[PDB]
Amino acid sequence: NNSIAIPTNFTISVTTEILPVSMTKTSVDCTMYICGDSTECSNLLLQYG
Amino acid sequence: SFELLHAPATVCGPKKSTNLVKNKCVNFNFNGLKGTGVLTESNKKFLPFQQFGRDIADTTDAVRDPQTLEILDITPCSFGGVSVITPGTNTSNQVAVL
């Protein structure tokens, strides 16, 4: 009840915080991935949706 | 009983061969394998039993030409997205293409 601790010296500390801000931007060609070079698939793909 | 497109084929249909063209985007029918691609000479090598070479996606990336027996790299014909940079139609109808 009658005792306290008071700091008699100081230390300056530098600490690193790393935060992600951005992610890789990607574009996907639907026709190329699903149907490759096949024209017939592309025509079928149009019907799908 | 026959197996399809996994080995060199000694039995073929009546289709007539055409002279190969390199460095151009072309439709190809190499021993029944059909694709559209640019065909280039390959600095790589193949074993005798290995007629066809596939990539990670399981799509052929190299083929051994029938007759000539020289391996040809298959590269997809150039493709890219098109984006139109446009000032508002009210301002102008002129457009830029990326």
DSSP string for A4-25: ----------------------
Q: Is B59 on the interface with A (CB under 8 A)?
A: yes
Neighbours of B35 (CB within 10 A): 19
Contact status, residue B63 vs residue B43, Cβ threshold 8 Å:
no
Q: What is the DSSP letter of A33?
A: H
CA distance B58 to B60: 7
CA distance A41 to B31: 22
Closest chain B residue to the Cα of A29, Cα to Cα = B81
Contact status, residue A7 vs residue B61, Cβ threshold 8 Å:
no
* Structural tokens at position A44: 């079928």
CA distance B40 to B75: 8
Q: What is the DSSP letter of A40?
A: H
Instruction: Count residue pairs from A and B with Cβ separation < 8 A.
Output: 10
Q: What is the DSSP letter of B93?
A: S
Contact status, residue B29 vs residue B15, Cβ threshold 8 Å:
yes
Contact status, residue B74 vs residue B63, Cβ threshold 8 Å:
yes
Chain A residues close to B37, C-beta within 8 Å: 37
Q: Is A41 on the interface with B (CB under 8 A)?
A: no
Tell me the backbone φ, ψ of residue B96, rounded to 5 degrees: -120, 145
Nearest to B26 by CA among B96, B95, B75, B87: B75
Q: Is B50 on the interface with A (CB under 8 A)?
A: no
CA distance B11 to B4: 11
What's the Cα-to-Cα distance from A29 to each of A17, A26, B20, B82, rounded to whole Å? 37, 10, 30, 11
CA distance B51 to B5: 9
- Which distant-in-sequence residues (6+ apart) come within 8 Å of B27 by Cβ? B34, B35, B36
Contact status, residue B15 vs residue B26, Cβ threshold 8 Å:
no
Q: Exposure of B95 by Cβ count < 10 A (0-12 exposed, 13-18 middle, 19+ buried)?
A: exposed
